[PDB]
């Protein structure tokens, strides 16, 4: 059924997403706590000092580099669990197969809330000029994915 979208439960463990507050600040404070709890060593974090004029988060610390190896990742939600800010929350995407090992290491810009599609989806939808079509539908979005607009007609 690649014709009819698969309904997954609102709790499902999909492609990680980083969230923002309303203010627009990123929730992440590059504490690297999520990476520290990961049983599979699949998160790499390089911190950075906020710019008072042009802020990224709220504290004095934001995430310069944020990288997850989607091949290493087991999808526990241990990271979402260890987070103090509600930053890294597993989302719904699953259509994320690909060809070259190192292409599957997602970056911060692959995961921000605003992003719609997995790496391969958006890339193809790049060289094609055709919008991204996700293959899922959910009854509603978790409260924890506040913002993450997705197919929720139910």
């Amino acid at each position: 059924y690649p014709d009819a979208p698969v309904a997954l439960k609102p709790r499902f463990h999909g492609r990680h997403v980083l969230t923002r507050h309303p203010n627009g600040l990123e929730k992440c404070i590059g504490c690297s706590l999520c990476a520290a709890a990961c049983p599979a060593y699949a998160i790499y974090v390089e911190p950075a000092e906020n710019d008072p004029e042009n802020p990224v988060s709220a504290g004095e610390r934001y995430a310069k580099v944020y990288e997850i190896n989607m091949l290493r990742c087991i999808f526990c939600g241990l990271c979402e669990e260890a987070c103090p800010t509600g930053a890294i929350v597993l989302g719904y995407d699953f259509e994320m197969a690909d060809y070259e090992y190192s292409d599957l290491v997602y970056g911060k810009e692959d995961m921000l809330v605003d992003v719609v599609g997995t790496k391969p989806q958006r890339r193809e939808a790049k060289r094609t000029g055709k919008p991204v079509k996700v293959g899922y539908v959910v009854p509603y979005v978790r409260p924890e994915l506040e913002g993450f607009k997705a197919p929720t007609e139910g």
Binding site: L33, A36, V45, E46, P47, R61, P84
Partner: protein, 754 residues
């Protein structure tokens, strides 16, 4: 010894012992904030409280175990509900006004406050547990504020131990930090803005929380994420144990590794904040000259191009020149390569006219135990940590007893604000040297004049008043020790008289050699032969360089091979075959201490590129010269050293040597020995490792030199710009140049270009 019974365990332990040490000694534990190895203990945090029984007659109030002595037949309870309830309470009083930064705070998983809270706090009274009682406005103050370009201060996190302010007063002796207001309002602050002393990075490893943090390494990774590489610091003769912290090839931060025999738990600032340059700009492939310029070449193309420049060479025209920090193995091969390949000129970057091997090495231990301290040179700058063993020596402190857990946590022997003895030492230096303060017998001479001061001390002339009081002091001295560094060891005259004075009286020496592995390379026979060509004398015709020599020794030679790590401008213009080499941070093998101790070097996971150690490069350039070398790798090299019979790690290797090759002194300029080395002027160490020019305010302004102007200066060792300083202690009509290399304690020509 005295009998103590901790909880259910009884232990032997010397009289003076802190109950805290006796407690830990039985293998127990207790919260412990304000006390620190090697500092005066005071009960200030009130964490280490125990219950004490002493006849069983429980004392009515709880004791600070860290400042309580132990009595014969004493009981110590550290588990009672009375104890534990009190602890959990004291943990609560601490966390009361604290900020809530743990995720953002760089003090991560290495924070004593965090560990002690999860250990002894939140007490189990016998459903829903209460985490925080205090529900008011926490203390809000000044945050993320740098004290120096190396140290950043969070005052909100400070827990008012005294670890830092105590230390400044006690160990280096530079009271540049103290508390301010009082009550709940007090805080750490400074008025000596720079953070003056050259031992200010140590407060970084002590501060029990993240108030005082290493700015050189702010926001890089969380403490557990760092891979830690224990090694030795080769920036000078002392060879302090260190830890090199690295994540993904780049060098993050330097810290101190305890090694009580030598440095205890202290590092010097150059030792700890000058790492900026070893991970920043570097030569990653072997270079070779093509069309008046150098270009990229494989190790293959470069082994041939090296066979070329040397095919036309007789084995006696060969030079073997190593750097000052070459390994004990790199110096042995070079000795053998140059032995089989009969050559007279093989030398090392820092070699001193008078060999440090002349004198019998003295252990830092001996220094504390000595009676009188005769010093010519500035320990602060030559062998910085000696500053700190003399701070202990001056206070009369002596080697502590060793418990099960090693160095004591609470040495009752160290009192806070101890008196300092000015009758115990004598300093002689070309300027108002730092430790000249803690010395009654002190006199400011001019460069290369020690030769005469030393003659006087023997008893064959007449020195100034100080030099007479000093002779008489070493006279009545029961077991004194001699310390000497630049001019003494660089000037055959003095150095010969030096070794004599200390021969007559059976006393050992501390040679603050300008070469780091000095005592060891000499031990390997890496000393020039009859011929003469030294590391600064342009002599041979085809030679290997482990560094960047004086422009005067390159210019001329037929073939040059520089085995650098970075690319100097003097190499990209006079060099034929340049080869990437590893720093001492990423090397492996052994060194030998200014006290004769053999220390190990371990290799940090830094970005080496296509680099190979001089042990390899040497073996490769021995082929292109005929004889196949006897050394390939470290495992096998180890057998050759063990053959000559050099003791294992930590052991001392005795090796004397009588012979000295003098050289004359063109006294116009003086290469003032400094702590900071010249290749550390990167990033933050940028301003602190700049060069300096010192002259007396008359002669200063006589040669057109304002008090704060950026002057260019030329020496046999190169053209360096330099800040110019007026100093009433600089001898008239001389100029002191910051000898930021291993060419310190030298007299040379040169002038100020305009």
């Amino acid at each position: 010894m005295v009998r103590v019974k901790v909880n259910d365990r009884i232990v032997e332990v010397p009289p003076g012992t802190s109950v805290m040490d006796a407690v830990f000694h039985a293998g127990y534990d207790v919260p412990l904030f304000c006390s620190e190895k090697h500092l005066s203990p005071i009960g200030a945090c009130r964490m280490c409280l125990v219950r004490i029984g002493l006849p069983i007659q429980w004392q009515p109030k709880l004791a600070a175990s860290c400042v309580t002595a132990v009595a014969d037949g004493m009981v110590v309870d550290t588990l009672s509900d009375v104890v534990r309830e009190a602890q959990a309470g004291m943990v609560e009083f601490t966390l009361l006004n604290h900020p809530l930064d743990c995720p953002t705070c760089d003090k991560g998983g290495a924070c004593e406050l965090q560990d002690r809270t999860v250990e002894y706090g939140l007490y189990e009274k016998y459903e829903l547990p209460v985490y925080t009682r205090f529900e008011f406005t926490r203390r809000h103050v000044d945050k993320h504020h740098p004290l120096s370009p190396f140290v950043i201060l969070d005052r909100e996190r400070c827990i008012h131990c005294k670890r830092c302010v105590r230390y400044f007063e006690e160990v280096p002796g530079d009271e540049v930090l103290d508390f301010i207001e009082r009550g709940v309002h007090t805080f750490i602050g400074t008025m000596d803005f720079g953070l003056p002393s050259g031992f200010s990075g140590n407060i970084t490893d002590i501060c029990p929380v993240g108030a005082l943090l290493d700015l050189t390494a702010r926001f890089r990774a969380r403490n557990w994420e760092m891979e830690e590489t224990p090694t030795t610091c080769a920036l000078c003769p002392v060879g302090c144990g260190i830890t090199a912290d690295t994540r993904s090839g780049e060098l993050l931060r330097i810290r101190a590794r305890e090694v009580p025999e030598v440095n205890e738990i202290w590092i010097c600032d150059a030792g700890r904040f000058g790492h900026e340059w070893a991970d920043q700009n570097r030569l990653k492939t072997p270079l070779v000259r093509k069309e008046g310029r150098l270009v990229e070449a494989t190790w293959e193309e470069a082994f041939l191009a090296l066979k070329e420049g040397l095919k036309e060479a007789r084995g006696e025209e060969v030079g073997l020149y190593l750097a000052h920090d070459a390994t004990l193995e790199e110096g042995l091969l070079a000795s053998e390569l140059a032995k089989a390949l009969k050559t007279p000129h093989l030398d090392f970057q820092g070699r001193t006219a008078a060999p440090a091997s002349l004198f019998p090495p003295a252990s830092l231990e001996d220094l504390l135990q000595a009676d009188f301290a005769l010093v010519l040179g500035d320990p602060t700058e030559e062998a910085p940590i000696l500053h700190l063993r003399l701070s202990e020596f001056v206070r009369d402190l002596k080697p502590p007893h060793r418990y099960n857990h090693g160095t004591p946590f609470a040495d009752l022997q160290i009192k806070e604000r101890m008196p300092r003895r000015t009758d115990k030492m004598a300093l002689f230096a070309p300027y108002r040297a730092p430790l000249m303060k803690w010395a009654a017998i002190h006199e400011v001479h001019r460069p290369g004049e020690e030769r005469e001061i030393l003659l006087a001390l023997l008893g064959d002339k007449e020195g100034s008043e100080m030099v007479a009081k000093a002779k008489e002091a070493w006279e009545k001295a029961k077991n004194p020790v001699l310390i000497l560094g630049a001019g003494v060891l660089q000037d055959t005259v003095a150095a010969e008289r030096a070794r004599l004075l200390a021969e007559r009286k059976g006393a050992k020496v501390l040679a603050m050699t300008p070469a780091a592995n000095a005592r060891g390379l000499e031990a390997m026979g890496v000393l020039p032969g009859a011929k003469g060509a030294s590391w600064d004398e342009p002599g041979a015709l085809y030679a290997y360089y482990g560094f960047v020599p004086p422009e005067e020794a390159l210019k001329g030679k037929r073939f040059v091979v520089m085995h650098l790590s970075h690319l100097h401008p003097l190499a990209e213009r006079y060099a034929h075959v340049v080869l990437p080499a590893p720093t001492f941070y990423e090397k492996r093998g052994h060194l030998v201490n200014l006290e004769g101790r053999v220390l190990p070097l371990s290799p940090a996971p830094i970005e080496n590129g296509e680099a190979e150690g001089a042990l390899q490069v040497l073996a490769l350039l021995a082929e292109a010269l005929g004889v196949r070398p006897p050394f390939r790798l470290h495992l096998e090299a180890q057998k050759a050293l063990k053959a000559r019979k050099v003791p294992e790690a930590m052991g001392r290797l005795s090796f004397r040597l009588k012979e000295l090759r003098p050289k004359e002194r063109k006294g116009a300029f003086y290469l003032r020995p400094t702590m900071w080395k010249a290749h550390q002027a990167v990033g933050k160490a940028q301003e602190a490792a700049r060069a300096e020019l010192w002259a007396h305010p008359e002669t200063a302004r006589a040669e057109a030199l304002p008090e704060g102007a950026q002057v260019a200066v030329e020496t046999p060792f190169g053209r360096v710009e330099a800040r110019v300083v007026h100093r009433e202690d600089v001898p008239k009509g001389h100029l002191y140049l910051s000898a930021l290399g291993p060419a310190a304690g030298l007299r040379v020509e040169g002038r100020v270009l305009v």
